[PDB]
Design a protein around this ligand. Structure first.
Ligand code: ATP
Ligand code: ATP
Ligand code: MG
Ligand code: MG
Lengths: 6, 511, 510, 5
C-alpha cells in the first residue's frame, strides 16, 4: 500500500 | 496606398471634411493629374448625398496614388484653404519630425481598457493585493519587458506546490500598464493541469477558441475531432489576426504542452512545479524560481491581513514554529490564518500542536487555493515521479527535517559508487521542489518540513519503521569499518544526535 | 490555365494586390476579353470584404484566362499602373532574361519578418541556435538553391537516428532569405512517421489541407472517406494556387510516401533514416548524409552549451570516452549534457560508467528530441527490418565495437539459409543502408564495423541467451587449420579483443 | 529474441 492513492 | 500617418491624416480630419467639401471639385483634377479614372469619376459624381461622395473620395483615392499630394495642392486652389494648411502642417510634423508619439497614452482610462477589459477577456485572475512579493513580481515584469521585442520565448516561473507562482503572474500582469497595451497587444491566460495524453490537445483547442472573435463562437464546430496538424495550422491561422500576444500557461504538467507552445512559435509565461519540462524547449529558455517565503516576508504576510506580532520569547518562537513548519509556504500560511479563529497566539500554538500529531490534515481549510490542503496538491507532484524516484521520496521520511546531511548518509536508506543517490535526489528537488541542494562545503541535500508531514501521514506506516531500522543498520555498518557546520565524517556513526525527532517518528510507526 | 511562373508573379505581388486593387474595377474590363462567366462575376462582385473578392479573383483568374494578358492591360488603365508595371517586369525578366529574375525582380522585397511568417504557416519547426552544423546546413542550402528551376525533385537528407537531420532542415530553411521568397514561394513541412498503410494517405490529407485557404478550412468534408485518385486530383487542383511550394517530409519510413510525392510531381526535401525508400522514385534523386559528429565537432557542440573544457589528460580522455560512447551522436550527446546536473567533468565520467553498466537507459532524459533515449528510436529501425536482417542485427552484439573486421569473421555469428559466404555482406549492407546501424568500408579488404551507440543499443535489447550463443557459436569456427585490421594469418585468435569479450561474458552470467 | 523490440 506504499503511499495512499497514490 | 497610404501609410498610418497619411491615413490618420485623411481619417482624423473628418469633423472637417464633411462641413466644407464637395468631391466633384477635385474629380477632374484627379482625373487629370493622373491618379483617377472615369469609372471612378462616375463613381464619385452621380451620388445623392455629399457624405456619399466624401466617403467615396476617402476610399477610392486610397489606391491609385503614391502619396498624399493632389489633395493638398487641390484644397489650396479651391478657396477651402482651411483643410489644406491643416493637412500640410500635419505632413510637416510627419516628415520633418523624426519624433512624434511612441506607443504609450494619449486618451485616459487605460485602467478600464486594460485592467478590466484586456485582463478580463484574456481570463487573467484577480491579482493579489493585501500582500505582494515585490522582488519576484518585479523580476517578472522586468523579464517580460526584455522580451516584447522577441519572436517566441519561454519564461518559467517555477516553484513548489502552494508556492505562489500563479498569483505572482496575476499581480505582475495587473500591476503595470506596459505588459498589456504597450509591450504586448493582448493576453491569453489558460490553466493546463493535464495528465492524460488528451489534456495537451484539448488545451490548445481552448486557446484557438480563446483567440476567435465573438462572431463564430456560435459557429463553434464539433472540433474535438480534427487532426493535430490542422488545429496547429488553425491556431497559427487565427494567430495572423494576433500580433504581440502574451500566453500565460498557468500550472503546466506535460512536457507536451511545452512542445506545442514551441511548434507554434508562441510567447509564454509558464507557471509550473516541475522544471525539467523545459529541456523539451530548445531555446532562450529563461527561468525564475519562486523560493520559500523567507522568515521575514512571512511576518509581512501575517501583518498584512491583520495578524498581531509577537512579544514574549515563547511567542516569537511560536511564530518561528509556524514558519519553520510551513517551510516558507504561501498557501499553508494562508490555510493557517483562515483556521486561526480567535486570532490569539494561544490558538495559533494550538494549531502548532495539531500540525505535528495529525499532519497537513490538521490545518486544511477553504482557501483562495484550488486544494483543501497542500497535501492534495503534492500528491500529484508525487504521482508524476519516475517509479524509483517515487521510492527515494517515500523513504526520505526517516531523515531529519531542516537538516543537512551528506550523500553517503542518504545512501543508507535510498534504493538501487553511490552517487546515483544524488541524481535521484536532484530529480526529486527539480520536480516539485521536494528536497534542497547545497553544493559545498560537501555535496549534501536536505528535506524541508511541509514536505515532511506530507510524507509522515502518507507513506506506508510500516515503511517509516523500516527506514528507521535500515538506517540504524547501515549506520552501525559505518561503525565497523574502524548550526553553520556540516556533520563530520568522524561522526556519521551516530545519528543519535537527532535522537529527539528520531524518537518521535519511531513512536509513530511502531505504536 | 496559367502556370507556375505567372502565378508566382501573381503570388510574389500579393502585398501589393492587397494594398491597392479592387476586383469590381477589373470585372468590367474583363467580361470583355473573355476570361470570365456570369457566375464568376457573380461570385466576385458581391462580397462583403475586399480580400474575398481578391482571393477569388486570383483563384478564378489562375484557372480561367488563356494567358496573363488582360491583367497587365488592366492595372495600366485603372491608374494602378504601379502594378501592371511590376508584373510585366517579372514576365520580361522571366521569358527573355532568366536567371536575372532571382537577383532583380524577386529579392528586393525580402524581409527577415516575412520569413518567420512563411515558416510558421508552413510548419517549419523553430531552427536551432547554440550550434549550427556548418558544412551540412550549408551544402544543403546549396543543393536546394541548385534545383528551384526544376519542375520536380527529391532531396534525401538521410542519417542515423538522433543524427541531427531534422534540425538541419530547420536551420537550412531559417538561414537564407533566398530559399523562401527567392527560390521557392511557400513551404509545407509535414512530419510522416508512417508505418500503417493508412499513414501515407492520412499524410497527404494533411498536405491537401496545408495548401488550403482559411476559408474552405471551415468547409472540410468527410475526406477521410474519399478515393486515392481524388485526394490526388484534389491536390494537383488545389496546387495551382500554390506555385513553387517546397515540401519537407520530416521522417519518411514508408516507401509509399516517396511514390505519392512522385505521382504528384511534387518538390521534396525528405528526412529519413532508411535510404532505400529512394528506389521508389524514377528521377533527379540527390542524397545528403548527416554523419556522426567528428571528434572535433563534438568539442564545438559542448563548448556551445556552457560546458567547461579539460586540462588534465584524463579529462580530455573523459571526453574521448563520451565521444567514443555516443559514437558521434547529437541526440545522445544532448541527453548526456542534459543529465550532467552539477556540471562537473566528474559527474560526466560518472555518466560514462552508468552508460557501460546500464546501456542507453543510464542517460535517457527530456530533450528537444521527440524520443526519451536513442533506444526508443532504434526500436523502429529494427521493427521495420526484413525478418533475416532482423536476425543479423540481433547478433552483431557479440562483436567488437569501434573495430574493423572482415566478412568471413562475420559469416561466423551471422545466419543464412555451400562455400562462398557473400550473403553476409549483402545483409550488412542492407543493414547499414537501413538506419545506418553498422558501417561498410570497401578496401583493403571488405570489412564492416559496429559503432558504440548501435552496440549498447543491442547489449541491453537482445535476448540474454543470444549473447552467450553468439560468443560460443563464434568460438567454434574459431580454430580451423591500432590503424591495422587483423590479418588472415592471425584470425584464429580473436583473443586480441578479449577485453570487450570478457565484459560481455560477465554480462551473460548476469 | 529482441527484448520486445
Ligand atoms: N502575494 C501572494 N503570494 C503568494 N501566495 C499568496 C499571496 N497572497 C495570498 N496567497 C495565498 O496562498 C495561496 C497559494 O498560492 P497560489 O495560488 O499562488 O500557488 P500556485 O503557484 O498557483 O501553486 P500550484 O503550482 O500548486 O498551483 C493562494 O491561493 C492564497 O491562498
Ligand atoms: N545542430 C544542433 N544544435 C543543437 N542541438 C542539436 C543539433 N543537432 C541535434 N541536436 C540535439 O539532438 C537531437 C536530435 O536531433 P534531430 O532531432 O535532428 O534528429 P534526426 O536526425 O531528425 O533523427 P530522427 O530521424 O530520429 O528524427 C535534437 O532534437 C537536439 O536535442
Ligand atoms: Mg498554479
Ligand atoms: Mg526528427
Amino acid at each position: 500500500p506504499m503511499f495512499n492513492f497514490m | 496606398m497610404l501609410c498610418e500617418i497619411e491615413c490618420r491624416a485623411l481619417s482624423t480630419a473628418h469633423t472637417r471634411l464633411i462641413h466644407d467639401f464637395e468631391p466633384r471639385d477635385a474629380l477632374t483634377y484627379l482625373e487629370g493629374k493622373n491618379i483617377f479614372t472615369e469609372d471612378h469619376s462616375e463613381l464619385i459624381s452621380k451620388m445623392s448625398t455629399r457624405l456619399e461622395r466624401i466617403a467615396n473620395f476617402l476610399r477610392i483615392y486610397r489606391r491609385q496614388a503614391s502619396e498624399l499630394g493632389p489633395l493638398i495642392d487641390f484644397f489650396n486652389y479651391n478657396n477651402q484653404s482651411h483643410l489644406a494648411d491643416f493637412l500640410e502642417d500635419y505632413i510637416d510634423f510627419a516628415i520633418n519630425e523624426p519624433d512624434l508619439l511612441r506607443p504609450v497614452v494619449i486618451a485616459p482610462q487605460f485602467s478600464r481598457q486594460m485592467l478590466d477589459r484586456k485582463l478580463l477577456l484574456g481570463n487573467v485572475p484577480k491579482q493579489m493585493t493585501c500582500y505582494i512579493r515585490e522582488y519576484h513580481v518585479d523580476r517578472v515584469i522586468k523579464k517580460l519587458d526584455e522580451m516584447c521585442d522577441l519572436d517566441s520565448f519561454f519564461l518559467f516561473l517555477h516553484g513548489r506546490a502552494g508556492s505562489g507562482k500563479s498569483v505572482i503572474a496575476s499581480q505582475a500582469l495587473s500591476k503595470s500598464d506596459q505588459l498589456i497595451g504597450i509591450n504586448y497587444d493582448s493576453i491569453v491566460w489558460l490553466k493546463d493541469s493535464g495528465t492524460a495524453p488528451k489534456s495537451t490537445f484539448d488545451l490548445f483547442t481552448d486557446i484557438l477558441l480563446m483567440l476567435k472573435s465573438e462572431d463564430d463562437l456560435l459557429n463553434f464546430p464539433s472540433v474535438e475531432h480534427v487532426t493535430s496538424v490542422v488545429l496547429k495550422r488553425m491556431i497559427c491561422n487565427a494567430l495572423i489576426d494576433r500580433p504581440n500576444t502574451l500566453f500565460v500557461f498557468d500550472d503546466v504538467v506535460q512536457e507536451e504542452t511545452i512542445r506545442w507552445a514551441q511548434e507554434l512559435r508562441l510567447r509564454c509565461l509558464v507557471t509550473t512545479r516541475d522544471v525539467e519540462i523545459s529541456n523539451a524547449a530548445s531555446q532562450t529558455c529563461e527561468f525564475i524560481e519562486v523560493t520559500s517565503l523567507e522568515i521575514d516576508e512571512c511576518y509581512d504576510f501575517l501583518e498584512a491581513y491583520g495578524m498581531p506580532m509577537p512579544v514574549g520569547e515563547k511567542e516569537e518562537d511560536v511564530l518561528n514554529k509556524t514558519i519553520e513548519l510551513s517551510s516558507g509556504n504561501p498557501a499553508t500560511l494562508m490555510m493557517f490564518f483562515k483556521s486561526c479563529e480567535p486570532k490569539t497566539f494561544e490558538k495559533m500554538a494550538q494549531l502548532n500542536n495539531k500540525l505535528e500529531s495529525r499532519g497537513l490534515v490538521g490545518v486544511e481549510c477553504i482557501t483562495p487555493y484550488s486544494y483543501k490542503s497542500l497535501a492534495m496538491a503534492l500528491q500529484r507532484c508525487v504521482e508524476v515521479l519516475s517509479d524509483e524516484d517515487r521510492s527515494a521520496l517515500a523513504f526520505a521520511v526517516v531523515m531529519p527535517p531542516g537538516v543537512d546531511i551528506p550523500v553517503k548518509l542518504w545512501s543508507c536508506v535510498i534504493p538501487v559508487l553511490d552517487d546515483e543517490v544524488a541524481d535521484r535526489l536532484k530529480r526529486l528537488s527539480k520536480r516539485g521542489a521536494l528536497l534542497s541542494g547545497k553544493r559545498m562545503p560537501v555535496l549534501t541535500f536536505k528535506i524541508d518540513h511541509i514536505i515532511h508531514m506530507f510524507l509522515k501521514h502518507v507513506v506506508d506506516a510500516q515503511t517509516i519503521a523500516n527506514g528507521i531500522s535500515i538506517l540504524e543498520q547501515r549506520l552501525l555498518e559505518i561503525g565497523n569499518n574502524n548550526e553553520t557546520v556540516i556533520r563530520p565524517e568522524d561522526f556519521p556513526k551516530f545519528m543519535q544526535l537527532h535522537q529527539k525527532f528520531y524518537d518521535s517518528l519511531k513512536n509513530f510507526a511502531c505504536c
